[PDB]
Design a binder for this molecule. Sequence first.
Ligand SMILES: O=C(O)CC[C@@H](NC(=O)c1cccc(CNc2ccc(/C=C3\SC(=O)NC3=O)cc2)c1)C(=O)O
Ligand SMILES: O=S([O-])[O-]
Ligand SMILES: [Cl-]
Ligand SMILES: [Cl-]
Ligand SMILES: [Cl-]
Ligand SMILES: [Cl-]
Length: 439
Amino acid sequence: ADYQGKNVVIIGLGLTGLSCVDFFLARGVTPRVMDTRMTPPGLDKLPEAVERHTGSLNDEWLMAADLIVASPGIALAHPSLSAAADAGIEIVGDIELFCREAQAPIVAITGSNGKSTVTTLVGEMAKAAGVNVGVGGNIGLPALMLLDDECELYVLELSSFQLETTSSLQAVAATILNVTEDHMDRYPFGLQQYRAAKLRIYENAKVCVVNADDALTMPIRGADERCVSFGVNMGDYHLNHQQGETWLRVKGEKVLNVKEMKLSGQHNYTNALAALALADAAGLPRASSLKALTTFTGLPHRFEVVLEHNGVRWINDSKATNVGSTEAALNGLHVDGTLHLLLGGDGKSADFSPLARYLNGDNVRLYCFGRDGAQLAALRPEVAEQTETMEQAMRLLAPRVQPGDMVLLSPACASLDQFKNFEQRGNEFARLAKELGSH
Ligand SMILES: O=C(O)CC[C@@H](NC(=O)c1cccc(CNc2ccc(/C=C3\SC(=O)NC3=O)cc2)c1)C(=O)O
Ligand SMILES: O=S([O-])[O-]
Ligand SMILES: [Cl-]
Ligand SMILES: [Cl-]
Ligand SMILES: [Cl-]
Ligand SMILES: [Cl-]
């Protein structure tokens, strides 16, 4: 694309907004920046040469623009943006800018859960093959910071929001791993509108990889041209259970005994299948992809044991920012004693009801905090306590912890009411676990 001479407005600063500023400056185009926040992240890094407007959107700038680059963190349906759209002004995001320039194939991954594990796993499979790979998007480097002539493959985690502003993605392999209720605060036409944003990922993809166990991951149409599938008991890529052992299979052929993996648990096994299906479709050698599966240890904040001491496991699953992710932590969970489960934050208008089925018996205590702490306590009030903050909840539960217990932060909610991001929430949990979980 050629931006020379265009009046470009970037909405949203932070690292990804900065990447957009830098992208245009390097092409001899000076954009203007606006952000509804008064002191947005990264403001001190914005050169004085770049005009900016903070604390609100500026409709004089937006209606004057030739191109608007919208952060995924701003609603596309914001009345200032719908006005610019109605007037015919082009609106894109950073992923669109990236797709227009990229000179290597792109593997594109979205889903309500699993998407960072699967992105990182395919990145590791590529490295194991000696491929020069750029991994990022919605995690790691903003995609524009990955752009490099020497890159041979890009692996991008994409959110529903990024996909809404992307039109030129033609992925060598794309997947929606699953769709479960999330981001209802941003999708006023509910589950089908959220799904529709994700289904954009398959448009012009060479191979589509779908979840055979989740119908919502399947395009609304495909004909003589089907997607590759992964699943538990069915799929092109699927699991084979043998006594107590599990295998990854591809069309009936065993390819890996999961004992070789460092990741455990069924949903990691289906993540491994999805990653293998994407790697295969991207042309990576099967054997090096399987080697990567054996060496991968998981991400921080993903069901991460931050302390096992004095007979108690303290588990940081702060990456669980929706109900489906906490379900995946609870379903089949083995605890010898009491489970002390921390839930709380901004639930984004989610129905928390699906969690209730995991919370029966005499061996569960709930400690519920943040914006939606009361709604969470209401799942089972007789075993619940509510506090304002996670630290209060930790200090309340710790004296009650006995050998055999588990303390699990798997909060089912965004952290953004009280924290910068779920990493900060996990790091704080870890520090407090280490304080409270030894003498
Ligand atoms: O870390 C957590 O705990 C919660 C993370 C949680 N993330 C989002 O909902 C989300 C959705 C879209 C984008 C992002 C990251 N990028 C952002 C960029 C700009 C903003 C805010 C802006 S831009 C502006 O102009 N005015 C704004 O307020 C917020 C996030 C985060 C979630 O999944 O619940
Ligand atoms: O720039 S981002 O990562 O908010
Ligand atoms: Cl503000
Ligand atoms: Cl084999
Ligand atoms: Cl110990
Ligand atoms: Cl029980």
